[PDB]
Amino acid sequence: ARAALNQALEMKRQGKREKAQKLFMHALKMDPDFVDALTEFGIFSEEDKDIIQADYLYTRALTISPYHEKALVNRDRTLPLVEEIDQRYFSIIDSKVKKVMSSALRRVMEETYYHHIYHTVAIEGNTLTLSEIRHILETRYAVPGKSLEEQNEVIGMHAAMKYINTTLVSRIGSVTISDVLEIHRRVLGYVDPVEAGRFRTTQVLVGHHIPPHPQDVEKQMQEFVQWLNSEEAMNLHPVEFAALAHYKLVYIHPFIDGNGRTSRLLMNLILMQAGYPPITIRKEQRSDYYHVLEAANEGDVRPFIRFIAKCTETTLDTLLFA
Amino acid sequence: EARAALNQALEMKRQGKREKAQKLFMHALKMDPDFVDALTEFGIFSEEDKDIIQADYLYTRALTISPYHEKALVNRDRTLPLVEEIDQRYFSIIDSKVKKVMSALRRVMEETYYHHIYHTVAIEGNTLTLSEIRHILETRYAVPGKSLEEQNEVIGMHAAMKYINTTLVSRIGSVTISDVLEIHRRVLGYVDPVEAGRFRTTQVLVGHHIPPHPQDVEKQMQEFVQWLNSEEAMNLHPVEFAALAHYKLVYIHPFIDGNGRTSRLLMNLILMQAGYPPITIRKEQRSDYYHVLEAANEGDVRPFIRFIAKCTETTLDTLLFA
Ligand SMILES: Nc1ncnc2c1ncn2[C@@H]1O[C@H](COP(=O)(O)CP(=O)(O)OP(=O)(O)O)[C@@H](O)[C@H]1O
Ligand SMILES: Nc1ncnc2c1ncn2[C@@H]1O[C@H](COP(=O)(O)CP(=O)(O)OP(=O)(O)O)[C@@H](O)[C@H]1O
Ligand SMILES: [Mg+2]
Ligand SMILES: [Mg+2]
């Protein structure tokens, strides 16, 4: 553990950049609570112009050891700088949403609907293609050679988003626990009608994450709905609120299945309510998406907020091609 | 040409013209089914061809319209006890066969499971074949060229009957409103998860039948469950209780869809609880099944009880082939 850090620091001296980067990663793979590695890797990353990652490391170091002097002097400088960097990116997104606020766009909107389904289902392991999804939703006929469950995941999504767009989007008032159960009722209804629209009865594992016990789900969902209809959350930038709402639901994991799908849809509800286009996390982005969700469980929700913001920009860029 | 047909039918009956009179009598009742004089005349005519059961139905129909019609009374006062004994004897013939039914049989039981689904779905209009149903339930893969809704009807049935057999069949105690909503939850869950497991909110028409208003469904369902757990129903022969339970549910029509399917399964619940094999109303029997259900709405539940009893015998006969 300490052997790797002393080796990484020596490699950093005079040359050997990629030899040190993998050595630093090794010392943190050995022990991610290595206060000395975190600050060293943080100071190292700041040299390659990555202040955001550096600050993450100094921050991770401080939660472990609050009076570590090297982490403090560094963090006392990055904290305000990183907050401005984040705030600037949000203004860049706002300028693009101002541009999107004003036949070619209609052809993009209809295909991105079928596309959103493709990615939201594929990210969970759905082997279906975009042409098969486009067929299933248009003919209502079964795609030959593919399982019923996979095609029922697709119908379920469609029923969920047609529900949000007709009932929920434009609706005035506070978001309730019944609304979330109603989205889940459609998401999972064609795959598991017994568990669709109802709270988890058993205890589950999501990677290395153990969600609240089924006995406490109802209470934690009550607090979450209350936070959605609170003014602290209402004061956040739309992208930050939408990412936090998504993380919090996913964290509670109130359902046996369809947590990620319901969250991604609740995220789009938050966005669209504040006049933002619906957003799509791609099949290819899965590995990064699970990495940033892990980083939030560990204590820092910021990388996930930036991930959701990179997605909002890539969705706003794709629309501005026409 | 109402009384004109009856006077013509009676003349045709004199000396000869049997089939000319039978269609003439049917015409007079197609013109007016509340023709007290046609009903008694057709009743006296049918008794000549050895059909006492149909005759009694007619004399009974005549008496509900006109209670003091002398010709209908003298005839009914003779058929009522005779027809009750005829019915009671058929029930004893069924009991003797259930006593007989109490590797070759195992091969019949497994195929009749897939068969029961084929008929219960086809009777509602499902274009799927027995080989396609056998595929869907074994591979869980979609049948090419057929709609998703039709295959989801099949999965739904299977979930419903696996539920009844594991939870409900052997269960000791009273049958509740929650049990019926739980069967419906599976029956219709893969086709309409929003309406599956819940009572009708709108008013519907079933042929010429207008079921109770959605406001009264809950009260009528409360009375029905109470009748299932009552001792008057408990004193009836198993076949008569199972047929009455099926008619009463179907009459209330508490669901937008899957009433016939839930009833047919509740019927099998009643039968199996009293040690009878599960019963199958065939695709081909549809026209007779809807005829006898109409006859009950009109005031006489007996033809439907005999229909369900003919089904129980044909199911007991098929088992005794091995
Ligand atoms: N490390 C982690 N900690 C917490 N939540 C995580 C996580 N990694 C993934 N998740 C979330 O949990 C979802 C996967 O959870 P699972 O229990 O595997 C099935 P699921 O709820 O059916 O998700 P789905 O709707 O994407 O299919 C992801 O889509 C994501 O939103
Ligand atoms: N004249 C009648 N009066 C009352 N019920 C009748 C009837 N004719 C038919 N039925 C019952 O009502 C069912 C058909 O009702 P519908 O409203 O058409 C659709 P359903 O409930 O989805 O039936 P399903 O499960 O057979 O598909 C029949 O299967 C039968 O059990
Ligand atoms: Mg899943
Ligand atoms: Mg039908």
Author numbering:
A (entry chain G): 106 to 207, 213 to 432
B (entry chain A): 105 to 206, 213 to 432
Show passages lifted from the paper.
AMPylation (or adenylylation) is the transfer of AMP from ATP to a Tyr or Thr/Ser residue in target proteins. Interestingly, in eukaryotic genomes only one FIC-domain containing protein has been identified to date, HYPE or FICD, and it is strongly conserved from C. elegans to humans. Here we describe the first crystal structure of a eukaryotic HYPE encompassing the two TPR-motifs, an α-helical linker, and the FIC domain of the human protein. We demonstrate that HYPE forms stable dimers with structurally and functionally integrated FIC-domains and with TPR-motifs exposed for protein-protein interactions.
The structure of HYPE E234G with the nonhydrolysable ATP analog, APCPP, shows a different position of the α-phosphate that would be incompatible with catalysis, suggesting that APCPP is not a physiological ATP mimic in this case. However, the basal activity of the wild-type HYPE is probably lower when compared to the E234G variant. It has been previously documented that the proposed intramolecular inhibition in several FIC domains (Engel et al., 2012) can be reversed by replacing the critical inhibitory Glu residue by Gly, using autoAMPylation as a readout (Goepfert et al., 2013). A Mg2+ ion is visible in the E234G variant of HYPE; it bridges the α- and β-phosphates and is coordinated by the conserved Asp367 side chain.
